[PDB]
Design a protein around this ligand. Sequence first.
Ligand SMILES: NS(=O)(=O)c1ccc(C(=O)N2CCN(C(=O)c3ccccc3Cl)CC2)cc1
Ligand SMILES: [Zn+2]
Length: 259
Amino acid sequence: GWGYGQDDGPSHWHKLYPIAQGDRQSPINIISSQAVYSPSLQPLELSYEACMSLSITNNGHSVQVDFNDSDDRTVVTGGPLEGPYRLKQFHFHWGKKHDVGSEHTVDGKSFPSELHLVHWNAKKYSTFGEAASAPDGLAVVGVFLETGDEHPSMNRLTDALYMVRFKGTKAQFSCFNPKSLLPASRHYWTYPGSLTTPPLSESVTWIVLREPISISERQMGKFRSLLFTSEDDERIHMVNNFRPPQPLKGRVVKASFRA
Ligand SMILES: NS(=O)(=O)c1ccc(C(=O)N2CCN(C(=O)c3ccccc3Cl)CC2)cc1
Ligand SMILES: [Zn+2]
């Protein structure tokens, strides 16, 4: 139904999911000088266990690592959140070249990729699916990826990409700690937004980290080697699987730091 191709891409999603034109859509272009410094915000804590990862999957839209979310062991708390949100999965958005790929932009600048750690309010909702539709249901932490030096921990993930190159394939992926993909700073920007893929529900509290992590061009290349297509189809590489910035519509972006 929807994708990132010329005929089914982001520019057309609004024809199938009208909420695409809503007042709290994501991603956005963060104008750093206009963010409101908010010291009242609590410190952001990403408390992640080392062995809660289950599998790695090419779902045709991105490569996603799923987690055991039966308890509150791997959660995000603090910052703009009232309580803990359990990590359900993480995935990425990337481009064909370095100048494009991320969903959020900062002062008009795009990064080659963006990592999304998707968490849900298990204290209020009974399931991730139920939470994905409520205003306070999800908390997504976004981390920008820049290309430069090789990222040691990333190797375990980029080396596994071959096994899920085709759409609809998956592999076991145990003991990968998502903390290894975080920068050494916990400063962030936060604003009320939405899922960046259909159904585009406005159920996400976005927490976009200020500091990007870096991976090598070789590692980035492993993502670009993935395919939107299945085994016996004409190969179309999975690239530019991102939604562009949406209207802010008067929302206020808060910052945990002074720029
Ligand atoms: N790019 S992003 O905003 O970080 C992001 C994060 C999470 C999701 C995602 O996992 N889903 C799948 C589940 N979603 C649903 O609306 C849903 C709920 C119940 C039954 C089926 C579905 Cl599709 C919401 C989208 C999709 C996109
Ligand atoms: Zn995403």
